[PDB]
Design a binder for this molecule. Structure first.
Ligand SMILES: O=C([N]C1=[C]C2=[C]N([C]C(=O)N3[C][C]N(C(=O)C4=[C][C]=[C][C]=[C]4)[C][C]3)N=C2[C]=[C]1)C1=[C]C([N+2](=O)=O)=[C][C]=[C]1
Length: 273
């Protein structure tokens, strides 16, 4: 950790230039900018007291959660969080091949899914619920090691009146204010479908619009997973694919109690390879 000056961060972000190439992404909770400090390329997240909680929620969890499959926080400071730069961005942007990056091989996809499961496993073992598991919050380092980000809106492992998260990924019970680690499982389910299909979780111009409903159609023998396997790879085999799809289907059980725990997800993803 460390305590950066707002002016230093401002200086290394070209006055937080809200224009891409120093900007690199934007959630609901803030904007992310590229920076250089201590000869280290960094990410700078600039973030009513709700927002100030998400800052300390990020610090509190990042103060007591270091794992190979979680992003690393370097410091803080207009509230600003500083992270180690993830040169290969988000799983979402790499699945979509944004900026012309090569399609991820099935081999790398299988590694990213296990990494992502291990990061969720560490969170759940340390009595944290992420509450916003999605391809955009799985980041990729210099070796394409999966790194879970955005532990804002996380909570100790109940109902809330402020339903938060990303609709296209959220469990039914989470959409009704419930807060259970089994919500993280369902959302990871949607991530596994993104990995298999290369399709976004919501596409306004697509029928169906939600990848969730594609999942349901396949369970009702009206679609097939083979017909949805991402065509932008040459190293997929049916066995590993339909084994990963099996994990996603178990993850996407509408009834929370019938979904596996993150430990069983990890095991099933290992058995796959
Ligand atoms: O670094 C954090 N995030 C982020 C990091 C990010 C890197 N990029 C750029 C990116 O992936 N690029 C990929 C390669 N590119 C090319 O053009 C290319 C290269 C080879 C062949 C063809 C094309 C362009 C650059 N985009 C990013 C967004 C977000 C981060 C964020 C947080 N966070 O709390 O938001 C925490 C920890 C780390």
């Amino acid at each position: 950790f460390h305590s950066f000056s707002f002016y230093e961060l401002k200086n290394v972000t070209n006055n937080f230039d809200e224009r891409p190439i120093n900007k690199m992404g934007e959630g609901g909770f803030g904007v992310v900018y590229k920076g250089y400090v201590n000869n280290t390329t960094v990410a700078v997240k600039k973030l009513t007291e709700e927002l100030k909680q998400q800052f300390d929620q990020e610090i509190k969890v990042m103060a007591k959660c270091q794992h190979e499959n979680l992003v690393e926080l370097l410091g803080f400071s207009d509230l600003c969080l500083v992270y180690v730069y993830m040169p290969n961005g988000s799983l979402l942007d790499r699945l979509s091949c944004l900026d012309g990056t090569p399609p991820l091989s099935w081999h790398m996809r299988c590694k990213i899914a296990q990494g992502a499961a291990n990061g969720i496993n560490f969170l759940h073992e340390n009595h944290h619920i992420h509450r916003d598991i999605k391809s955009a919050n799985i980041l990729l380092d210099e070796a394409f090691t999966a790194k879970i980000s955005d532990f804002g809106l996380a909570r100790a492992s109940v109902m809330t009146s402020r339903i938060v998260g990303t609709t296209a990924y959220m469990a039914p019970e989470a959409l009704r204010g419930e807060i259970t680690p089994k919500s993280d499982i369902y959302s990871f389910g949607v991530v596994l479908l993104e990995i298999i299909t290369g399709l976004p979780a919501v596409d306004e111009h697509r029928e169906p619009q939600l990848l969730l409903d594609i999942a349901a159609a396949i369970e009702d023998e009206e679609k097939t997973i083979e017909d949805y396997i991402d065509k932008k790879m040459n190293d997929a085999d049916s066995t590993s694919v339909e084994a990963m799809y099996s994990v996603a289907s178990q993850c996407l059980h509408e009834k929370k109690n019938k979904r596996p725990d993150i430990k069983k997800v990890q095991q099933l993803l290992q058995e796959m390879t």
